[PDB]
Amino acid sequence: VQIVYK
Amino acid sequence: VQIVYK
Amino acid sequence: VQIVYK
Amino acid sequence: VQIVYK
Numbered sequence: 001v002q003i004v005y006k
Numbered sequence: 007v008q009i010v011y012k
Numbered sequence: 013v014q015i016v017y018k
Numbered sequence: 019v020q021i022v023y024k
Contacts, residue, residue: 001021003013005011009019015021 001007001015003009003019007021013019017023
């Protein structure tokens, strides 16, 4: 589970 | 579980 | 983002 | 981001 908001 | 807000 | 493992 | 392991 890898979640990136950018 | 890796979560990044940027 | 709703992730469920069961 | 809701993550549940069960």
